[PDB]
Design a binder for this molecule. Sequence first.
Ligand SMILES: [Ca+2]
Ligand SMILES: [Ca+2]
Ligand SMILES: [Ca+2]
Ligand SMILES: [Ca+2]
Ligand SMILES: [Ca+2]
Ligand SMILES: [Ca+2]
Length: 395
Amino acid sequence: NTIRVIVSVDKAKFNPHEVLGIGGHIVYQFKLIPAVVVDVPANAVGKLKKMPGVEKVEFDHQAVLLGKPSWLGGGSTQPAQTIPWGIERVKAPSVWSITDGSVSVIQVAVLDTGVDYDHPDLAANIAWCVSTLRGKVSTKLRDCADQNGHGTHVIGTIAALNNDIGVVGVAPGVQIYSVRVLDARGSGSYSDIAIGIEQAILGPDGVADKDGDGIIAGDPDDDAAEVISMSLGGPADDSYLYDMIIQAYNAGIVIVAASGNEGAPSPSYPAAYPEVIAVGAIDSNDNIASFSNRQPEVSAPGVDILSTYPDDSYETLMGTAMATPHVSGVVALIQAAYYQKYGKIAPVGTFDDISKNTVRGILHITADDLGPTGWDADYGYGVVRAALAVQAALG
Ligand SMILES: [Ca+2]
Ligand SMILES: [Ca+2]
Ligand SMILES: [Ca+2]
Ligand SMILES: [Ca+2]
Ligand SMILES: [Ca+2]
Ligand SMILES: [Ca+2]
């Protein structure tokens, strides 16, 4: 009988009781942007628009996961640790002796279906679990656990442990925050995904900048993530969500997102935003996958990708969702190594960037440039390479 909407407001004029008085419900008041997620009856949407302090009324759109089980491969047919082909393709393993991600100030937030937080090849890296489903922020593990599989697979491509079992991530020492914004079927509301972005900025302690110095990502006094990774996509561009992507970007957080799997001519949202790295998928032959949405920023392995899967298991998945965490891994290695040497993180940088002084510039100039020379609509700048990116970072 009610509909979910996201109102952008003037905080000094807006009275939430007025929503309540028209038979509405306050779902979530954002700490970092001037907006509130509310449920209202249909009849009331008109009233909302007129109420004092309400500047925009946006409806709640849907995004979905961007990984599916592979047509080809299977599980980890081997009790030893396997290095999935993708981890090698992005030249991660040689980097680990310089850093594997385990620099204390670095956390990577993965906004997905949740995580199997007990998985033996993941657990020691899972630093915090949260769920924002239906706009209720929960840190009960039973609410944060993965009921799909996809988030556990994505998290394993970034950070599965480097040991003698399972698989291994691009950044196998990096601390992960699993932020569950998608349900058991892989579907999520934009309102929950924006709440998840907020949570990755706030971190475990619920405060963005606890010491007031204006540094959030790359402040060891705070517990903000440095990378937000979204292996998901929807078709709408909404102002409140972009407002949140901007808060994370201004916080110094690198945001990375799947381009989409529809062979479409451009990326889905939030990948399509300027402030987000859109990632396409290649296969084990260096061909762009036919399903990969075009004009990404970079590309990475996304076909026939073995990783962790719930109940202490392993599965082979495909999609731009699988490509995304390879790039999130590489970004974590860049920021870890950058901080380890300089005692701060590097700036995020722009889509455009070709300087060795920003994360995005480094990723671009060190990518393996495939297909047409330079940036192209299939590969973007090319396949990310961690070993070269770290060398560029420290140079
Ligand atoms: Ca392992
Ligand atoms: Ca915090
Ligand atoms: Ca701070
Ligand atoms: Ca500080
Ligand atoms: Ca941090
Ligand atoms: Ca090219």
